[PDB]
Symmetry: D5
Subunit: 56 residues, 10 copies
Amino acid sequence: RPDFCLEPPYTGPCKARIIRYFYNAKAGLCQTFVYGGCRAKRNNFKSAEDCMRTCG
Amino acid sequence: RPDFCLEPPYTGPCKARIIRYFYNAKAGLCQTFVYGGCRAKRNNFKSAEDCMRTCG
Amino acid sequence: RPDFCLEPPYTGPCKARIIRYFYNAKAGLCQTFVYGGCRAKRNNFKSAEDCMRTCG
Amino acid sequence: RPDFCLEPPYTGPCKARIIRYFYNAKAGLCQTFVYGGCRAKRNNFKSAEDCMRTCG
Amino acid sequence: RPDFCLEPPYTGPCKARIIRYFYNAKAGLCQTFVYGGCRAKRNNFKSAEDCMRTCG
Amino acid sequence: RPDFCLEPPYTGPCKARIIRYFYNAKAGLCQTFVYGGCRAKRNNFKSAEDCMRTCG
Amino acid sequence: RPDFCLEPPYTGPCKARIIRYFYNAKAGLCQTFVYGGCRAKRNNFKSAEDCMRTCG
Amino acid sequence: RPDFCLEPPYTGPCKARIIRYFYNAKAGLCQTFVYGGCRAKRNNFKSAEDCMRTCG
Amino acid sequence: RPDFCLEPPYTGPCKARIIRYFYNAKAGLCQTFVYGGCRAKRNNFKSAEDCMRTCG
Amino acid sequence: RPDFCLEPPYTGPCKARIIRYFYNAKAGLCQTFVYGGCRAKRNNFKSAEDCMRTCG
């Protein structure tokens, strides 16, 4: 499992309010958080599928 | 019909304005509510189809 | 966890070749399968999010 | 509810494999069916929410 | 065309600003409006094809 | 309305099967047809909204 | 091309902020503008494809 | 406009039948074609806005 | 690669909050940025694939 | 850069023609391949954005 999947989700400094998915290491599944629209870190997925499959 | 299908919709603490679907037991079908983007409860569906079939 | 999440995925008799998601009880996560487009059973989700959240 | 809501789903002659939604009076909910692309009848919805709200 | 197709469009008390279609009986065509995310009335269509097929 | 709104729908030579909208001068509204993927003619719209707005 | 392809883009009175396309008669192509959600005018397309096809 | 915008559209050896846009240098506008799913050449756009902004 | 690929992202003046993609020469890949809705500059892509293929 | 980012794309045994993204290490960016719809390996991304960030 990529180390980056253990990083807290990261909204960044931008205005948008968009759903993205991140791996919650502790709950052990992908959840939703709000993403500003810029300067994404790696635990950030457009698609929940991609999320589970990358950090499952 | 899972228990969670009877809990009221939960916006959550986040500040997004994301349309979602919850099963309305009183009414007997899925309806739209506004989801804040994080900390979702289980009566929350990105897809209306998924909502009617899971809670139908 | 809804009992229906333990049912094998079910393509049905229709022509379409569409991705949908089902809960693989054994692997313990949601995966892709092909859905014919009609006569869905309950372990079938338009959205991977909805899938995890309903059968996680 | 409207009366076209009582018609059976019509795939029509054309060759596309597009998921659409029809009200199924019997089961009392909107379901998926394959629409062929041309010559649709009235019990036929692009959006499941439209179907639940119109024929629900 | 069903009676509700004559109801004026209804935004609702919710906080989203999402595009929906309504049948405008005067002009005799479907048009856009802003729906606020919840408590939609029946003359409210996510898809335009559904609006004109159901009300036009 | 533009004179192109009257010409029949042109599926074209290509092999794809994509739902597109066209103005049905006779029936007075926009209906679906199957576009092939190339050599489109002008009575051909990706969006049903656009079709009614332009040819309605 | 239709005479409506020349009129300026009409954002309108409504509160939404939706990206739409319009024909820029001057620059000779379709550009983006922000539509408000209601009282659209005809130089307004949901699909960029439609815009170039109609006004190009 | 970059040179590749002049390359004719390329379907590829793959088996899908997906709509894409290419700049057609003769006509001087972007148009549709069928891409087969793999080994796209650069004059191949998922979005039309991107095609005309990049090649038009 | 084209030279507009070297420009910095431009949000422009308008108020929408739409994720778009720009090539970031420094990091050597396309990234997200917020586009405002009007007056886009050329290093601006609706689709990430378009961005990677055009400026990759 | 996870190991899986270097495995070749895998269509799988299913018969869908679903566009997806894999990271091409040889080329140094994500490209499209055709995914059969089941039994996906990890170098499979519904979203190009997710692909470039996970394997970039």
